[PDB]
């Protein structure tokens, strides 16, 4: 009946895709399966995963798929009656959560070497434990939160003033400059964004991102793979201990 919220109709150029997208994902995965000798299942647990683009650009000759886990699992076939190939229903067992597929014509040892030597510093992301205590120095605040030397830093922006206040930093707008306390930095104690051994919240993570401070690591875990020639799945060290389907 009445007394309902008004959903906004967005004046937008791109709309929802739905069934056609699901079908083209099935079609792409199924046409990719016969082309490649091995299919790796990898996991990216609590990372931002924007470096997957660099991963693709490095592994151009390998096809990486990162879609919905259930759609990918059924595209490969969850049961040994609807499986496209042998053992693929045993790899859909490793397709559990925030995971992805990597069809390769390469060597498993080379793939594991690459994915063990690839490692990129990245922003904290919520739920991670703090390795160190980040504190914003009292006084004039800069674009790094007192991590780089202050002499080598630029003042933070007055358009970031309100966002910082919303995120909870008791800052002020003094003579065109954002200041925590006063410009003397003698009337207020600093602001500790995160403390050691404390699970970070989204507020703290967003503050760290705004101050351009990275506390987490981007690394891809390789749970297992499947060889088409043997039609066989191999369990790797990471996939030994992960909530399975």
């Amino acid at each position: 009946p009445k007394s309902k919220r008004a959903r906004v109709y967005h004046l937008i150029q791109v709309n929802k895709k739905g069934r056609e997208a699901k079908e083209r994902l099935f079609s792409n995965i199924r046409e990719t399966i016969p082309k490649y000798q091995h299919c790796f299942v990898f996991s990216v647990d609590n990372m931002r995963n924007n470096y997957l683009k660099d991963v693709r650009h490095e592994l151009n000759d390998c096809r990486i798929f990162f879609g919905k886990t259930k759609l990918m699992a059924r595209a490969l076939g969850t049961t040994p009656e609807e499986e496209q190939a042998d053992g693929l229903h045993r790899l859909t067992r490793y397709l559990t959560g925030t995971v992805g597929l990597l069809f390769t014509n390469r060597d498993p040892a080379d793939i594991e070497s690459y994915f063990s030597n690839l490692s990129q510093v990245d922003f904290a992301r919520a739920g991670t434990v703090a390795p160190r205590t980040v504190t914003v120095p009292t006084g004039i605040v800069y674009s790094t939160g007192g991590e780089v030397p202050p002499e080598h830093d630029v003042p933070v922006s007055h358009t970031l003033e309100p966002e910082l206040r919303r995120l909870g930093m008791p800052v002020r707008m003094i003579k065109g400059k954002v200041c925590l306390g006063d410009e003397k930095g003698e009337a207020s104690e600093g602001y500790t964004i995160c403390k050691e051994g404390e699970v970070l919240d989204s507020r703290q993570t967003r503050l760290l991102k705004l101050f351009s401070i990275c506390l987490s690591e981007f690394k891809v875990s390789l749970l297992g793979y499947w060889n088409s020639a043997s039609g066989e799945v191999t369990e790797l060290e990471a996939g030994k201990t992960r909530p399975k389907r």
Binding site: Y9, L11, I12, Q13, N15
Partner: peptide
């Protein structure tokens, strides 16, 4: 409110059409 709702509905319809898709003054002036 009637005018606003008519304008909003016209805008929505025109936008949907355009997203799906990929003289008397002259004589009087003379």
């Amino acid at each position: 409110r009637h005018a606003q709702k008519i304008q909003m509905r016209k805008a929505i319809k025109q936008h949907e059409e355009r997203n799906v898709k990929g003289t008397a003054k002259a004589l009087s002036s003379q």
